[PDB]
A paper describes a structure:
Our initial chip-deposition tests with water-soluble proteins showed that direct deposition of a microcrystal slurry without any cryoprotection, followed by blotting and flash-cooling, was not satisfactory. Fig. 3 illustrates the positive impact of the addition of a cryoprotectant on the loading of insulin crystals onto the chips. The number of insulin crystals that visually appear to be surrounded by solution is markedly higher in the presence of a cryoprotectant. To correlate these results with diffraction data, microcrystals (<30 µm in the longest dimension) of insulin, thaumatin and HEWL, in their respective crystallization buffers, were mixed with each cryoprotectant and loaded onto a chip. For the insulin and thaumatin crystals, 25%(v/v) propylene glycol produced both the highest resolution diffraction (1.35 ± 0.03 and 1.76 ± 0.09 Å, respectively) and also the smallest mosaicity (0.12 ± 0.02° and 0.22 ± 0.10°, respectively). The same insulin, thaumatin and HEWL crystals were loaded into the different mounts, and diffraction data were collected and processed. 25% propylene glycol in precipitant was used as the cryoprotectant in each case. We conclude that loading crystals onto the chips provides sufficiently similar levels of crystal preservation as standard mounts up to a high resolution range, allowing the low background and high loading area of the chips in serial crystallography experiments to be made use of.
Numbering used by the authors:
A (entry chain A): 1 to 21
B (entry chain B): 1 to 30
The structure:
């Protein structure tokens, strides 16, 4: 989930935007 | 600000700025 993709590895805008409503 | 390790409030802040008026969901246990 978001922690694995953006906290314990480097985040990206592509990934972050998957969590916008 | 997005292309780094972002945890906790730092990650919520990034979601807040990127998502804007869409809002977002923060589901750390999923
Ligand atoms: Na904003």
């Amino acid at each position: 989930g978001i922690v694995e993709q953006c906290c314990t590895s480097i985040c990206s805008l592509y990934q972050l935007e998957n969590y916008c409503n | 600000f997005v292309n780094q390790h972002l945890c906790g409030s730092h990650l919520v802040e990034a979601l807040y700025l990127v998502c804007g008026e869409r809002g977002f969901f923060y589901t750390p246990k999923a």
